[PDB]
Design an enzyme around this catalytic site. Structure first.
Site, PDB file in Angstrom:
ATOM      1  N   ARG A  54     -58.847 -33.894  -2.779  1.00 30.25           N
ATOM      2  CA  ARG A  54     -59.220 -32.500  -2.915  1.00 30.25           C
ATOM      3  C   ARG A  54     -58.281 -31.883  -3.942  1.00 30.25           C
ATOM      4  O   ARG A  54     -57.074 -31.999  -3.820  1.00 30.25           O
ATOM      5  CB  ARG A  54     -59.130 -31.813  -1.524  1.00 30.25           C
ATOM      6  CG  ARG A  54     -59.656 -30.442  -1.449  1.00 30.25           C
ATOM      7  CD  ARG A  54     -59.589 -29.950  -0.032  1.00 30.25           C
ATOM      8  NE  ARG A  54     -60.674 -30.510   0.776  1.00 30.25           N
ATOM      9  CZ  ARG A  54     -60.618 -30.749   2.072  1.00 30.25           C
ATOM     10  NH1 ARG A  54     -59.511 -30.469   2.743  1.00 30.25           N
ATOM     11  NH2 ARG A  54     -61.687 -31.249   2.700  1.00 30.25           N
ATOM     12  N   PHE A  59     -54.364 -23.503  -6.902  1.00 30.90           N
ATOM     13  CA  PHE A  59     -53.855 -23.682  -5.542  1.00 30.90           C
ATOM     14  C   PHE A  59     -53.100 -25.006  -5.401  1.00 30.90           C
ATOM     15  O   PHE A  59     -51.879 -25.008  -5.351  1.00 30.90           O
ATOM     16  CB  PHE A  59     -55.034 -23.555  -4.568  1.00 30.90           C
ATOM     17  CG  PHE A  59     -54.676 -23.644  -3.096  1.00 30.90           C
ATOM     18  CD1 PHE A  59     -53.362 -23.760  -2.659  1.00 30.90           C
ATOM     19  CD2 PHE A  59     -55.691 -23.639  -2.143  1.00 30.90           C
ATOM     20  CE1 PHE A  59     -53.068 -23.866  -1.301  1.00 30.90           C
ATOM     21  CE2 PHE A  59     -55.406 -23.736  -0.769  1.00 30.90           C
ATOM     22  CZ  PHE A  59     -54.086 -23.860  -0.355  1.00 30.90           C
ATOM     23  N   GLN A  62     -54.313 -32.241  -3.339  1.00 29.53           N
ATOM     24  CA  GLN A  62     -54.076 -32.772  -2.005  1.00 29.53           C
ATOM     25  C   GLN A  62     -54.263 -34.265  -1.976  1.00 29.53           C
ATOM     26  O   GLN A  62     -55.280 -34.789  -2.437  1.00 29.53           O
ATOM     27  CB  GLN A  62     -55.015 -32.098  -0.998  1.00 29.53           C
ATOM     28  CG  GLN A  62     -54.816 -32.599   0.420  1.00 29.53           C
ATOM     29  CD  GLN A  62     -55.710 -31.901   1.428  1.00 29.53           C
ATOM     30  OE1 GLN A  62     -56.462 -30.981   1.105  1.00 29.53           O
ATOM     31  NE2 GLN A  62     -55.663 -32.376   2.656  1.00 29.53           N
ATOM     32  N   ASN A 101     -51.428 -29.892   7.006  1.00 32.35           N
ATOM     33  CA  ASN A 101     -51.481 -30.098   8.449  1.00 32.35           C
ATOM     34  C   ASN A 101     -52.786 -29.559   9.002  1.00 32.35           C
ATOM     35  O   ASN A 101     -53.588 -28.962   8.270  1.00 32.35           O
ATOM     36  CB  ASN A 101     -50.245 -29.471   9.127  1.00 32.35           C
ATOM     37  CG  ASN A 101     -50.175 -27.977   8.924  1.00 32.35           C
ATOM     38  OD1 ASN A 101     -51.133 -27.254   9.213  1.00 32.35           O
ATOM     39  ND2 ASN A 101     -49.042 -27.501   8.420  1.00 32.35           N
ATOM     40  N   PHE A 112     -49.596 -31.345  -0.142  1.00 27.21           N
ATOM     41  CA  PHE A 112     -50.083 -30.601  -1.291  1.00 27.21           C
ATOM     42  C   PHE A 112     -49.024 -30.653  -2.387  1.00 27.21           C
ATOM     43  O   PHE A 112     -47.830 -30.440  -2.116  1.00 27.21           O
ATOM     44  CB  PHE A 112     -50.249 -29.102  -0.990  1.00 27.21           C
ATOM     45  CG  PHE A 112     -51.242 -28.759   0.066  1.00 27.21           C
ATOM     46  CD1 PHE A 112     -52.353 -29.513   0.281  1.00 27.21           C
ATOM     47  CD2 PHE A 112     -51.064 -27.614   0.818  1.00 27.21           C
ATOM     48  CE1 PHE A 112     -53.266 -29.164   1.234  1.00 27.21           C
ATOM     49  CE2 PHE A 112     -51.981 -27.255   1.786  1.00 27.21           C
ATOM     50  CZ  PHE A 112     -53.085 -28.033   1.994  1.00 27.21           C
ATOM     51  N   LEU A 121     -48.847 -19.780   2.238  1.00 31.05           N
ATOM     52  CA  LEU A 121     -48.546 -20.936   3.054  1.00 31.05           C
ATOM     53  C   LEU A 121     -47.219 -20.816   3.779  1.00 31.05           C
ATOM     54  O   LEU A 121     -46.917 -21.617   4.670  1.00 31.05           O
ATOM     55  CB  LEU A 121     -48.510 -22.211   2.204  1.00 31.05           C
ATOM     56  CG  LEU A 121     -49.801 -22.600   1.467  1.00 31.05           C
ATOM     57  CD1 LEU A 121     -49.576 -23.956   0.795  1.00 31.05           C
ATOM     58  CD2 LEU A 121     -50.992 -22.665   2.369  1.00 31.05           C
ATOM     59  N   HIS A 125     -46.566 -24.236   6.519  1.00 33.89           N
ATOM     60  CA  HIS A 125     -46.447 -25.551   5.907  1.00 33.89           C
ATOM     61  C   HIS A 125     -45.002 -25.802   5.547  1.00 33.89           C
ATOM     62  O   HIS A 125     -44.334 -24.935   5.032  1.00 33.89           O
ATOM     63  CB  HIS A 125     -47.307 -25.600   4.644  1.00 33.89           C
ATOM     64  CG  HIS A 125     -48.759 -25.468   4.940  1.00 33.89           C
ATOM     65  ND1 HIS A 125     -49.593 -26.555   5.041  1.00 33.89           N
ATOM     66  CD2 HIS A 125     -49.517 -24.376   5.208  1.00 33.89           C
ATOM     67  CE1 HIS A 125     -50.807 -26.144   5.362  1.00 33.89           C
ATOM     68  NE2 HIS A 125     -50.789 -24.824   5.470  1.00 33.89           N
TER      69      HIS A 125
END
EC number: 5.2.1.8
Length: 164
Positions: A54, A59, A62, A101, A112, A121, A125
């Site tokens: 992803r 952003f 991943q 997570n 990430f 975040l 995270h």
């Protein structure tokens, strides 16, 4: 001195280059150790050959699902999802490495690489590292992402390990 690990990134099998990361073992030793060991392969499994499933421009990128390769998998070296170690470090800009997570205390092996300041975040995270060299490669990767994170090419970790 904190440990440094690298990923060699490939796109549809062709080399893009090497990204290296500093892991903040001085602040989050458990979370850093998990990523470190998965990068070397010393426990007999890990990130080598896995993909970034992803990528969302503005952003993150991943990766880390080395078991199912689609975001439903991954496992830590601790044999169970593990706790959020702390939130000492914040998401201060591009190049930050932070854990993905499924809610509090569900850390596995997914992560990430942030391609922007992702302050939304913070406190959810665990930040555990940052890109040291190769930020332009991360910028190049981001260009293969789209809405909802769909990638237009297969971006893989062709090799990985620990530097001196």
């Amino acid at each position: 001195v904190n440990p440094t690990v690298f990923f060699d990134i490939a796109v549809d099998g062709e080399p893009l280059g090497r990204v290296s990361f500093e892991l903040f073992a001085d602040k989050v030793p458990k979370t850093a150790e998990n990523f470190r060991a998965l990068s070397t392969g010393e426990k007999g499994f890990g990130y080598k050959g896995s993909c970034f499933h992803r990528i969302i421009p503005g952003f993150m990128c991943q990766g880390g699902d080395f078991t199912r390769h689609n975001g439903t998998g991954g496992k830590s070296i601790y044999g169970e999802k593990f706790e959020d170690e702390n939130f000492i470090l914040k998401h201060t800009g591009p190049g930050i490495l932070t854990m993905a997570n499924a809610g509090p205390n569900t850390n596995g092996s997914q992560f990430f690489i942030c391609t922007a300041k992702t302050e939304w975040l913070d406190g959810k995270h665990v930040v555990f590292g940052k890109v040291k060299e190769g930020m332009n490669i991360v910028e190049a990767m981001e260009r293969f992402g789209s809405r909802n994170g769909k990638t237009s090419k297969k971006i893989t970790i062709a090799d990985c390990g620990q530097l001196e």
